């Protein structure tokens, strides 16, 4: 037959998964493009600075395009139609190129965002010494072009194969990577470390230092240059410490399992692993890509809805279209 590529999955479970992906796609698309146009009108409303406005725009743009690009194909050809795979050989090579570039965009983008959050407080002179509009534009174009260039290896690695019992079969074409096993181990370790490890270190250490300095100011003005926000010394700084730690735990909890599963595919031996894990792996893929898309949707509300001012303009604009 062709049952070697039969992803044994419960249909009710796959239905529930597809409901979750559909809901996340709706709220992510709507909230992300609403955040984009809200923020662009906030340049037209706050009207004084565009320092990190471009960073948040790039992040919302990344999240929007990764949701709308990756979610259809990752719904159908992976969760639903596992065996035939009907969306094109160079098409699927480009598809893996796209999701790799988008993950890299979001990764290095939230990294550079947090580095800017650090550089604002730690060196209040050096941003005005460097970060002009030109510096920010060149900076985010640099981050974006790096995210484009690092993705090139997956286009050279993620092949396609009619890997059925014969060559010609019913739907035996299945977009698996076609490189050697050492090669895919190298590129998956490269993608994993380069996409997450030093983003984890950079985001974690920088936001940890930011939380430490904020807590030190909270302790120094707990019993009361000067830099004091007296009604928000409890309220605003409490929200600040909460959202800083929240952003890093959100990021860690949301992206650890995904390429953790990639590395599970990588450091996997056929002799070593039985079929029991296999079914758990397909289910784990469902849960993993689910959590990665809620990663793609979570960051906008924590970077706009954390403020009330962006929530003010966002209520003004989400009420405007509807």
């Amino acid at each position: 037959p062709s049952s070697e590529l039969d992803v044994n999955t419960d249909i009710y479970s796959k239905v529930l998964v597809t409901a979750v992906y559909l809901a996340l796609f709706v709220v992510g698309t709507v909230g992300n493009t609403v955040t984009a146009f809200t923020l662009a009108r906030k340049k037209s409303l706050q009207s004084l600075q565009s320092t990190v406005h471009y960073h948040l725009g790039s992040l919302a743009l990344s999240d929007l395009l990764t949701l709308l690009l990756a979610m259809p194909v990752e719904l159908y050809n992976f969760i639903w139609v596992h065996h035939p795979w009907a969306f094109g050989d160079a098409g699927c090579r480009g598809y893996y190129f796209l999701r790799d570039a988008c993950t890299y965009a979001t990764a290095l983008n939230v990294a550079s965002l947090s580095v800017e959050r650090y550089l604002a407080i730690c060196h209040p002179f050096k941003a005005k010494t460097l970060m002009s509009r030109s510096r920010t534009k060149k900076f985010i174009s640099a981050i974006w072009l790096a995210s484009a260039l690092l993705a090139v290896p997956m286009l050279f690695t993620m092949g396609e194969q009619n890997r059925s019992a014969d060559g010609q079969h019913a739907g035996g074409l299945v977009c698996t990577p076609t490189i050697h096993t050492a090669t895919v181990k190298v590129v998956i370790q490269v993608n994993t470390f380069m996409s997450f490890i030093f983003p984890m270190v950079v985001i974690s250490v920088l936001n940890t230092i930011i939380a430490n300095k904020l807590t030190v100011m909270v302790r120094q003005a707990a019993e009361q240059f000067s830099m004091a926000i007296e009604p928000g010394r409890v309220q605003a700084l409490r929200h600040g410490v909460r959202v800083l730690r929240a952003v890093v735990i959100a990021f860690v909890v949301c992206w650890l399992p995904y390429h953790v599963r990639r590395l599970m595919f990588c450091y996997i031996s056929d002799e070593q692993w039985t079929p029991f894990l296999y079914d758990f792996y397909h289910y784990f893929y469902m849960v993993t890509n689910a959590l990665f898309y809620v990663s793609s949707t979570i960051n906008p509300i924590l970077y706009n809805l954390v403020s009330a001012n962006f929530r003010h303009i966002f209520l003004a604009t989400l009420a405007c279209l509807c």
Partner: peptide, 6 residues
């Protein structure tokens, strides 16, 4: 069989 999808 090693999961083809990745």
């Amino acid at each position: 069989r090693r999961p083809y999808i990745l």
